Amino acid sequence: VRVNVLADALKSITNAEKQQVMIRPASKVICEFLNVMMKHQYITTHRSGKLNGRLNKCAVISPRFNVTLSEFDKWEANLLPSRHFGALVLTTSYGILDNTEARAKHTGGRILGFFY
Amino acid sequence: GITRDSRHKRRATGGKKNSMQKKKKNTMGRQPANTRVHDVRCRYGIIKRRALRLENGNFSWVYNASDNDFVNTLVKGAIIACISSRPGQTGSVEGYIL
Amino acid sequence: VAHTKPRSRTSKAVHEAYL
Amino acid sequence: GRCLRNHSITYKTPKVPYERERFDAELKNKKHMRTIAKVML
Amino acid sequence: EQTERAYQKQVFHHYHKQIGMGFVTPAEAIKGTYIDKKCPFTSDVSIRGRTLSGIVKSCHMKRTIIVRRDYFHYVSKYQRYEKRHKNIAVHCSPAFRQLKEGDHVVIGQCRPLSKTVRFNVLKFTSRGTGDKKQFA
Amino acid sequence: ARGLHAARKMLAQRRANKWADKEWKKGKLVTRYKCNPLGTASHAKGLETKQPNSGIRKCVRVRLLKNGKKITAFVPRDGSEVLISGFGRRG
Amino acid sequence: ARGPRHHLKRLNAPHHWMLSKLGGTFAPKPSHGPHGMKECLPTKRNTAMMIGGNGMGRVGVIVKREVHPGSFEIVHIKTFTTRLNN
Amino acid sequence: GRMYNPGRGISRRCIPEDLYFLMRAVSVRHLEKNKKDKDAKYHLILIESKIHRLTRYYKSAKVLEASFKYDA
RNA sequence: AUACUUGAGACAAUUCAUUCAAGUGAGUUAGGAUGCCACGACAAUUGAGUAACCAAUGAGAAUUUCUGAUCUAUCAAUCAGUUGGUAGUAUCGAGGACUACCAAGAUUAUAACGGAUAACGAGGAAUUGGGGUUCGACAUCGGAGAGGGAGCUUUACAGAUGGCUACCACUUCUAAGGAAGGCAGCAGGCGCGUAAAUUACCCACUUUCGAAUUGAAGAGGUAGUGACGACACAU
RNA sequence: AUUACUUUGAAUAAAAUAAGAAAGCGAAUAUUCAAGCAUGGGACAAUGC
RNA sequence: ACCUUGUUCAGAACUUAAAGAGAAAUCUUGAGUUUAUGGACUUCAGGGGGAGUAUGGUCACAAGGCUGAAACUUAAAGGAAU
RNA sequence: AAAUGGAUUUAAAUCUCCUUAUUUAGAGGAAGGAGAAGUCGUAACAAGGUUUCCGUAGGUGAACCUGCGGAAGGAUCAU
């Protein structure tokens, strides 16, 4: 059964960019995940209504591990291609952000996914 | 002899505790000298007036709630007036008129 | 509209009740 | 523990015992901060 | 209440005090005829440092109930939690009559009252009925 | 299980699967104290080859002081209470 | 222990006594009196003075004093925070 | 997909009591004369589990008081 | 006699019943008053010493709240003082700690109950890119023990064992009637094993005990053996 | 409404670890997690209303 | 209605692949979207033998089924392709 | 205030049945494993000369053989 909309959404995007893409269920996390992926420029029905050569791979992380601020270094070192390219996506007490402002907003929290 | 520690009782689940030491003096119990007056050297050097038996008693203005068998031991709350002191500890019987 | 008490004070419960 | 006085090792033998590119380069006998730099970078 | 071999009496006989940090004495405590030597509000037993909560698991015991606590235990290696529970026996004064199994109760730590009982019910909140209205 | 609250199974799953480990199990079950002739000790004071190799291996049988079991022991060199200490391969 | 302890170990001695770790096996035991074992000696550790926690050795003036009926009460000083006893 | 069968149908309306209707349970408990019909017996269990799943659901929704227990 | 008492220069705290009642988050609370009982002084001291009580030392001792331990289902049901209630007893003191009456209760698949350890726990150690795996008797903290149990004495503190008593198991002296002892303190001997040092000197460091600046200390320091290991360093 | 989560503090034996020839002796020396206390936040969550 | 065509579902399949995956055979409605490693859950495996054997437990009238080791032994056993 | 008698408490030590670990045991045995050249056969690998294998049942010096039902890992992707 459909457990995570975010997991289904990002896999739909990757397979299309590997090959515009459509996401049938839209949530409060799916869209505002994209606003992070759009401010990095990577991306250009009454029932939870329903790409520019830059996205390499966007994926979610299974259970959203609480991330301390000190723990940021371990996650980036694992899930990011380099120290200058990718971006995590964090859900924190002040909205869904990435490793840049969440390091600057001085907060931690759970981790959604990433995109190279 | 008589100890008062919970190292020999069971657990709330019914488990049997296992011995890890021997009886320690801080759990001392004493033989109950029923008051049908001695002194006992308790810990820290204080004295306990152990009234073995006694008949007179100060009072201020036939039945034992705990054990009917006691009916002529003298204990607190016993009816004779109702005793209010601890004769086995204080060494005297102080009671009040019902 | 309180910080996010029963469901009789929540926004779409009271703002509909207000409506 | 065994002793209050501290002690340390002042060397470390190589992992690979025999390698020609090391025998020549090293040739009385054959008897830290880089990572410290690393952690702040 | 005088259904036992001794004339039950209060502790400060001449009585109702109040518990400390932000609590309210229940109504049934004052007007209630019950004589309880271990009642927090109508006796000489106080509530010291610790203060816990939980749901009530059993209401069969005389003047005593069982509180169930559920929590989590983070495990380092797997970076995940596991559900765990602990049950503690809490003395409950007759000042609470509507209290039944499945309700949520704020408790406080008092002196050793029995082999297992060391806490006292302070404030209770009832929940939905678990098909069995089992009270103290 | 992968969810955030499923730490009980994977901890339990790993404990079960460790027993499949031949090397790990040998060091925990009770055979190093009853089946090992050396026990857990290093040395032990006491009192024809395979198909493609021909000859004779000179050997010795030894009864151990402590256990009393009899074991076969090799002699070290050419033309060569006894202290016996294993071989290259452990056990 | 059968009774109250009398000897004191060098390592177990309080930190601020500045005793070395190799001078001798034992350290002088403070006798009972007006000051405790760990609050006496037989910022390197109204206007007030900090004698307790991390702020020990600091002088300054209080701004406000939160109180929590549960456990303790907190004093804020010109700013650093610490309990009343400090 | 379907709860018990592996079929995956998508017949739906498209917008621009049920527990009662499952006691089907009585209409087959038919098993009296046909005692050898093992197909009916296997399908009787499936329908019963539908009831208990619905029974458990309605109780927690307070639709049914929690004394409900369907029998034969 | 500053051992033991009586005895006076004149109170202090215990029990009990009633009452007035301000800190603390919180007290019929510290405290005051009434009547009773109990106990009853500041050595009949010496060239500093002493009794009773209050406070501190005391975050200490002791009990206790919460969370946290290795393997095991070829351990799945377990508990009857068991779980709670009343009233007493006993305790330095809470409490089934115990006794009499009353009730049927407590735990368990979120692993109870039971079994194994070549298990004293922690601070820590070895090794690690991150993550982890293995060890921790052994410097320091806490626990427990003195051949095995058990029962006690003295005191402020002991269920003390370089104190006693009895049994079990041993050791030793004996004039043959009797008699003592507890190295898991320091050395040292045997036995065991692959596996581990001198039957040394001294209170001079650190510290402790004492009627006290002195005395004593196999604590402690010094010296001896010592390819366990570590650092520098001949040929 | 609690809880979880998260940010800051309080409080936190030494030795040791790292740190301001092996050594030795005042580092702000920082720990040291699992809990527990206080606090700013409520996006993702769980518990009834 | 039966046959001929289009459209959109459900079902059993089949054909091609210069792509994706794999050790390859092959797979493609997955055995793809996996070191660029995390959608949810259950079960099983840890070189080859000894061995599904012993012991113990339990189910069956029985044959047997389910659960299930260790001692000891050995440098290979095995897979797909030339 | 000592010997001593008596009744409680705490109870060592010992006896009787029962609960875990470690050991001695012969007829009576019954398995497995290891060691160049010892016997009897042809079972398997080609259609291995009766295709092979699985479950089950029976027989048989031994590989195994035969019956019922499956599988291709078949020697047929095919009328």
Ligand SMILES: NC[C@@H]1O[C@H](O[C@H]2[C@@H](O)[C@H](O[C@@H]3[C@@H](O)[C@H](N)C[C@H](N)[C@H]3O[C@H]3O[C@H](CO)[C@@H](O)[C@H](O)[C@H]3N)O[C@@H]2CO)[C@H](N)[C@@H](O)[C@@H]1O
């Ligand atoms: N491995 C145990 C069993 O042994 C059985 O048989 C065993 C023996 O009966 C068999 O014996 C073979 C024999 O088949 C062959 N025709 C002649 C050969 N000399 C024998 O050999 C065997 O015995 C001799 C006796 O001297 C030993 O030297 C030699 O090492 C050993 N392999 O060799 C085997 C090993 O001992 C089965 N062959 C085997 O499948 C099974 O696994």
